[PDB]
Amino acid sequence: PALSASSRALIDEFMSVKQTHAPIHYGHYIIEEVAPVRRILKFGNKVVF
Amino acid sequence: PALSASSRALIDEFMSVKQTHAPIHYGHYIIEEVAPVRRILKFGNKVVF
């Protein structure tokens, strides 16, 4: 599975804090990418690997 | 992109805490500058690389 965010709020909160992010919200969901490759995800300055 | 803040409260948050800040408020937004030069940000006491 790849990164799929139903609203931009989830991709923002996931990129903000990796550990305590909400995988599931009320009406919106988000799937963490799990893959044989792992990529550096940068937005602005913030970094999640 | 250069540093752009819609309201002073966002740039105060961003200087206060780098990581956990919001990029997007209700009607206000903030852009982190991405440049090959990284200046040192000395607003007040607080220092941001």
Curated annotation (Swiss-Prot), chains A, B:
How does this polypeptide assemble, per the annotation? Homomultimer. Makes the hexons and eleven out of twelve pentons. Interacts with triplex proteins 1/TRX1 and 2/TRX2; adjacent capsomers are linked together in groups of three by triplexes, heterotrimeric complexes composed of one molecule of TRX1 and two molecules of TRX2. Interacts with scaffold protein; this interaction allows efficient MCP transport to the host nucleus. Interacts with capsid vertex component 2/CVC2. Interacts with the small capsomere-interacting protein/SCP.
Q: Which family does it belong to?
A: Belongs to the herpesviridae major capsid protein family.
Q: What is this protein called?
A: Major capsid protein
Query: What is the annotated role of this protein in its UniProt record?
Result: Self-assembles to form an icosahedral capsid with a T=16 symmetry, about 200 nm in diameter, and consisting of 150 hexons and 12 pentons (total of 162 capsomers). Hexons form the edges and faces of the capsid and are each composed of six MCP molecules. In contrast, one penton is found at each of the 12 vertices. Eleven of the pentons are MCP pentamers, while the last vertex is occupied by the portal complex.
Q: Where does it live in the cell? A: Virion; Host nucleus
Q: Which domain of life is it from?
A: Viruses
* Gene this protein is translated from: MCP
